[PDB]
């Protein structure tokens, strides 16, 4: 079983988006009004699941083939790859990255999305990948398109991919979103504006990576994720 | 001051979080292996319990698109970190409240006692992280049991909460569902009866 | 018949791309080596066809419906509108605007396009519109995607739509391409780079136009087009 | 000095110009009305001819994806600008050399004479703009006929070309194609025999 | 035998010198006028000789001792050393670095060199070296002198050393020239100016390295050499 | 977009490239071991052949100072990357055209067939890199054999070259020099009959 | 992106709004023609009705200085835009709550049905704009009727309000005031039972 041998750097809650961000409307009735209580780190917060033995299917990170109904998805073919490190710059090997996203027109494969852009019979939109020894992960997919949503009267979410990352503990787990370099919708989005600092928004922007693209085939973006920094305990209970 | 690299900032999991992580509950086809709400298989050691609840927004309406992740010790108070679908007990699991299930549920065992960093026992508890559209960064809380009143009262984490009335919002109320021992635990996000949330 | 009353501002051949731009490889064998012969404007040059009487089908400008074979194309739905003026700022009414493009994955519907992204059964990629009295045109299409082409070993053209505008005369006619605000492929493309001045490159970039978008349905881009200035003759043959 | 709005810059038509302006020639479904290579219906005044040719690159190789738009006077030396599929004669038209048909063709009547701005008559001629992958800004040229050497020697435009050997590259050679008067105009983009191109 | 497991990032041909650079006279007749043809990387392109078992002499890297006819060469004694890394910064181990230069007066030990600065009886000017596991090489030699050549009427090459590096394949192979920090002849050379970008010329200037000099013995220069980055293939043929 | 560290820029090899890479050709004493022009020892498996050619500049004059590196598979279509002068066959070698030898020559065997990355066979060929004074960056080419026309016709690289007339410039012509199988492969750098060069 | 001229920013109407827009309400001499609270003269076609209500701030206190404006369809469901005191029915009026009268009233007819832009009929309704000191930019709401239950269930605009409990804040209650058919519509600006407000 898991041992309590690490502490995690504290979160900077003025860097992350706060809970109450009124232009993102649903945040109004879903944000606490009392202050969070701070508690020290114990074995509960410092351990978490390890997925090295989950049995991944062979196409799990390849969204051009894992849904497959006899053919390929329509849309821009792209590899989305990067590394996961901690704040000390140390790779985070064998971690689980999960990601889900729309199709080329912005439609999500879900009961409630009645957007009028159609479904793509060959695309499902889900991937998972355990990072290697070196913190690397990779997916293959199509570039999702933007979608309108019911926030203000003409709001468009920019193109995006949702990421879920586990890290070494429930203290490091994070859910975030990846945007795409140059999308002119990035700065008008209320969800992206829920992040107050413009340099915190830049880290959510995936950058075109020509170096990792397959010539005559697909482009590549690079997206690197930094999790809370991990350190050994020291001078504790004297 | 020394500055390290900054963490990647959080964004809301969104309304469609079920497609990437609650595959079944979105009624999309599953893969061979999914992480779900069955922490203990029927023959794992311990006292088998079913947990259930609802989540509320601050107007008192139901949150039907929330997604939860739980982490608890086994009945011996040990955290089981090697996640495997063959094990009898896994310390991690995921559940969700849907348009068709206003309620989440989890099947597990009552966790055993673990100590904090100073050596002091914590009352049995289950760590909960709550995600949903509208929540920009996830919410941390702990579910405790109403039948462990004495341990709950000497708990070094529950005792950091200043006001006694706030400590109650973390206490799941025992009940029974078809001969099986169940505990309810509602979460109020905002308002009157606001569940305590943590930062760690 | 047509009359000689107009003279057109001389094309600036340092603003348009030159004929030999070696990085764009097919220009090497297709560029003249002699100089062009400059000739004064006569009626052969200042006249041209007026297509006010062509018989436009009712979806000629609508790519979402014009190919039709069951449904809607898969892709970001956008409207592409703008105005066609001359260099003096005058509108150019009832002039012909033709456009064609690839589908959401970068595939052209043409026998010779062997790229592996697939064809979209509901999409063709051609439209025409005749500007209204004020010099306006609009199309409704899907954003197209980048395509790799064999110039250099990993060249990718940016997402683009081809344009063909007649104007008032064969002297003014032009064919060009529209690029999309923010696309990071633009500064890398040798076809974009055949234009030496960067301010000229800017004029090809459609801009996101949230004021023209239909909420809950499609985005809009604005693309205005400037044809050679037209003037009355003055003090000619004394 | 006074500056105006700059003209929009030109870009090559690309290898797929056909899908946009030669629907038929790229074997794709046509619309009702398409602007093509038959400038004259058979009931039209004038001498009916048939124009043809090939375009070569500087290596001597056929350019198989070029596209050409033509502008000309009818038999009476008048430009008919009101394009309509019903007119017996249209002053405008479009043709293309394809992979399947490596030579372009046009069906029209030989043009009547028009005057320059100074009032001086020009030899009968067709104004041609050429487009293709590889050509960043389109090429202007004029086609003249070999059996009109008295006019071709007086032409104020042919006489602007300094060197007479270059004037010959603008003169189409008379022939017959199943006894129907035809003229052949081959365009050499670069090199030995290079066609003259104009600027205006 | 050699296996097809790596791809190499494409060359930037606008960073490297273009073929036709007229001021370097000799390039006018030796540059091609057709465009190169891009071909995808195969086993023919991604493999190359490995020289680990080439029998090297004990002084093959020391030009102070490898020609020797009873003495030491005349000129400034210098160590030229550096690291060979690919564009990802990964060292290139056991790779063959060869170099050749003039003597201290600029005279080349070659039948066709007729310059009047005299030959140096103890100096050949050729050296080779296998980089170590960490990508380092060093040569010990004397600083070359400049020499006139017949390009323009008063052209002088700056002092330089020629260098060839094999790399892991025939796609990484590169011949280049090392120049010396602060030499005023460098911006006037038409061969150095065949490189259009000034940041690229900088990459060929070896910098004085006092920390590597042998006190009372010889100065040192540091020349690091970057080869095309190498990466594993991914998602190829599906 | 992601910039990596830029590649060191190339520079010409210069007139005296022989002194450092072709020791014997420049008539300077050699070392124990030299990478030279004999890729096969008399007992290596395969058809032994002799390779020869000349190099021409754009004015049809002879380049007498070029240097050439060759890379080819052995007779069983395999690349021998461990260079050792004791091998019966080395896949690499070097040669040169000198003020004395206008012609270069290489002694090796005919390569077997290797596949491209997609699994398709390529025709037997030998990869060449040409270096010289006036060349700022080296030129890459392939040498294919006229007696392999059927495999040449379906080579997928040879097939990337658009014009058929240009494919022939890469085809070496079978001859007999002192009753030994020889093929001549001349390189025209510039102008009429300009060899195809590649980028990869 | 394309930026247009920005609209002139709003400012609160301030406590004295009655002096410029509700002249009799503020006890000042009126002009000949005033835009007021009587949309229908008595001979107009339709069900005549009296609408009345009160406006509450977040503390449950009455807003005695509010100013409102209504826009509605006539009994056929048509909007009459040409405002004229001579007409029988006018689609616009104005009203106010004063320190004297804590309640506003309007005299008009029940609007008929109008379709949305896709052609799906909306329940009958009255558009309201609320102005007052303290309100930086006006609040847009809709008044609907309790007797149009069948139609309120299928309204596409009311079905845009996600929570059923909130749609009720938009429903006026049927009553009688002096033998006339009356609907009471109170507006809660803030707090418990807050009226839904729209953006468009
Ligand atoms: Fe989303
Ligand atoms: Fe195109
Ligand atoms: Fe030199
Ligand atoms: Fe005031």
From Swiss-Prot, chains A, C, E:
It comes from Pseudomonas putida (Arthrobacter siderocapsulatus). It is an enzyme of class 1 (oxidoreductase). Belongs to the intradiol ring-cleavage dioxygenase family. Binds Fe(3+) ion per subunit. Its cofactor is Fe(3+). This is Protocatechuate 3,4-dioxygenase beta chain. It catalyses: 3,4-dihydroxybenzoate + O2 = 3-carboxy-cis,cis-muconate + 2 H(+). The enzyme is an oligomer of 12 copies of the alpha and beta chains. One of its GO terms (biological process) is beta-ketoadipate pathway. Fe cation binds at residues 108, 147, 160, 162. Gene3D superfamilies: Aromatic compound dioxygenase.
Curated annotation (Swiss-Prot), chains B, D, F, G:
SUPFAM superfamilies: Aromatic compound dioxygenase. The lineage of its organism: Bacteria, Pseudomonadati, Pseudomonadota, Gammaproteobacteria, Pseudomonadales. This is Protocatechuate 3,4-dioxygenase alpha chain. Pfam families: Dioxygenase_C. The keyword Iron applies. Its EC number is 1.13.11.3. Coiled coil: none annotated. Keywords: Aromatic hydrocarbons catabolism, Dioxygenase, Iron, Oxidoreductase. It comes from Pseudomonas putida (Arthrobacter siderocapsulatus). The keyword Oxidoreductase applies. Belongs to the intradiol ring-cleavage dioxygenase family. One of its GO terms (biological process) is beta-ketoadipate pathway. Binds Fe(3+) ion per subunit. 3,4-dihydroxybenzoate binds at residue 133. Plays an essential role in the utilization of numerous aromatic and hydroaromatic compounds via the beta-ketoadipate pathway.
